[PDB]
Design a protein around this ligand. Structure first.
Ligand code: GDP
Length: 495
């Protein structure tokens, strides 16, 4: 029945953690790696390409945890990682609830209907009450919460958790203690006065809580919520068990001509990011990757050998070097590549769709220190935008170069690269813009009118796409009203 390819692909669980800085991602990542027996990798993560992709075995699943750069390293590449996973894990600091970056990263997951599980971290310190945390998750992540584990107390009074389906009490300071219904005197023996509160909460959950439903989880409509304390490696086992059991394996991926299924024998993969020193990171969409093989780079029309590929793999497995759907590989190259590029082993022309550019929130105008360098600046900005390092907008009404960054670090990298690779010394000037949307209107007449009236706010980006630049989302909301026929989108397909 199942081929070797389909058996391997079915074992993969490829995901990333979405969280706001200081929620606990690094700490939880270290503990996950320890369950995976990935001792060295955990030591590496705790000490801070090697860590962009961490693969580890757990309960015979091959888990691929892709890093989502955060803090000062937050960039459009963080959102690009989310286009390569089949599911995500949300980590929240229980004292803060859903925070700004949690929401923006969930907005990306939502466009892709990516399933998400949720870990509420730091229950060992005073926290939002669990009913309030659940309401906050639903309100800001726009998803139903299905509690899987439920905390008893918080902070100094945090006794541990009760696992609703496994009927197990997990004590905080280790095997769960099996509990036999709400009346089990084991609850009073282990929880003391807090047993009454667990009983009240369980009664409330029975009446008003949402059960886990795998189909709703897989559609992105419901998230299983776990509570714990990653620093104590507590509650993490239950969440990981649930993740390997229920999180989706490699999913079909749309291409312009058809949907590609992971069980197709012929290799296909898509580039979702590029690291400059260059390495292109490819998600394997179907088929089997082997070092030996030849791949067709359909954009350039060239054949590419991959004898120098990086196969990210666990310290653990030993056999012949191959990689399967859901896995990530890195292909070194001398600058040939765009985000979204498709590689195939067959001659079938395939073009994966659905890796977009994302609307930037930070904008700067570029100024040259030396006017004689104008052609080099145009070359460098165009090549850096084609490569995905920044977005570039050219306003209809002037000749300015306006750069759009998802993360501010990007502006520093562009200046560095302009200097080093183009011999161009550029500085930034501030602009009013904080918002871009790509505009579209299937009515040719109304659109010409829009483009005439709002000519001062329109720009064309490096892909040729028309965009409305606004000082902020509220000023934007006002142009939308004047033209209820024009669509304003927060993403656009790369070509
Ligand atoms: N008290 C407590 N502190 C935690 C827990 N998890 C992480 N921290 C602390 O919170 C801070 C942020 O943790 P980190 O894992 O680096 O967060 P990141 O920015 O999301 O990767 C550090 O001081 C951690 O020790 C937890 O479960 N309980």
């Amino acid at each position: 029945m199942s081929s070797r390819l389909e058996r391997e692909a079915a074992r993969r669980r490829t995901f990333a953690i979405i969280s706001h800085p200081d929620a606990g991602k690094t700490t939880l990542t270290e503990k996950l790696l320890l369950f995976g027996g990935a001792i060295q990798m955990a030591g590496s993560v705790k000490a801070r390409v090697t860590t962009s992709v961490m693969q580890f075995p757990y309960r015979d699943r091959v888990v691929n945890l892709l890093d989502t750069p955060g803090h000062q390293d937050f960039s459009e590449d963080t959102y690009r990682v989310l286009t390569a996973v089949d599911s995500a894990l949300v980590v929240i600091d229980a004292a803060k609830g859903v925070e700004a970056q949690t929401r923006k990263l969930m907005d990306v997951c939502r466009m892709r209907a990516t399933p998400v599980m949720t870990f509420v971290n730091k229950m060992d310190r005073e926290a939002l009450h669990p009913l309030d945390v659940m309401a906050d998750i639903e309100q800001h992540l726009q998803i139903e919460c299905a509690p899987m584990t439920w905390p008893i107390g918080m902070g100094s009074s945090f006794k541990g958790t009760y696992d609703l389906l496994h009927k197990q009490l997990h004590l905080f300071s280790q095997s769960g203690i099996v509990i036999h219904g709400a009346d089990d005197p084991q609850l009073d023996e282990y929880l003391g006065d807090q047993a009454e509160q667990l009983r009240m909460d369980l009664a409330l959950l029975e009446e008003a809580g949402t059960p886990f439903d795998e189909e709703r989880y897989l559609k992105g409509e419901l998230t299983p919520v776990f509570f714990g304390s990653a620093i104590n490696n507590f509650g993490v086992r239950e969440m990981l068990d649930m993740f390997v059991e229920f999180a989706p394996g490699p999913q079909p991926r749309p291409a312009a001509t058809r949907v590609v299924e992971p069980g197709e024998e012929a290799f296909t993969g898509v580039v979702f990011k590029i690291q400059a020193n260059r390495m292109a990171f490819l998600r394997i969409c179907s088929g089997t990757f082997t070092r030996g093989m030849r791949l067709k780079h359909h954009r350039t029309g060239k054949d590419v050998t991959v004898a120098n590929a990086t196969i990210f793999m666990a310290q653990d497995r030993t056999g012949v070097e191959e990689a399967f759907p859901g896995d990530i590989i890195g292909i070194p190259n001398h600058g040939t590549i765009k985000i979204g590029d498709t590689f195939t082993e067959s001659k079938e022309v395939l073009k994966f769709v659905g890796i977009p550019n994302f609307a930037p929130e930070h904008f700067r105008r570029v100024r040259l220190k030396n006017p004689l360098k104008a052609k080099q600046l145009q070359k460098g900005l165009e090549q850096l935008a084609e490569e995905g390092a920044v977005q570039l907008f050219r306003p209809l009404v002037n000749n300015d170069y306006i750069l759009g960054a998802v993360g501010v670090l990007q502006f520093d990298v562009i200046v560095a690269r302009l200097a080093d690779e183009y011999g161009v010394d550029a500085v930034y000037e501030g602009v009013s813009t904080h918002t871009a949307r790509w505009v579209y209107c299937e009515d040719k007449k109304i659109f010409a009118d829009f483009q005439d009236y709002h000519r001062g706010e329109l720009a064309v980006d490096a892909e040729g796409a028309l965009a409305y630049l606004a000082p902020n989302p509220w000023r934007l909301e006002s142009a939308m009203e004047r033209y209820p026929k024009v669509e304003f989108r927060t993403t656009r397909e790369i070509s």
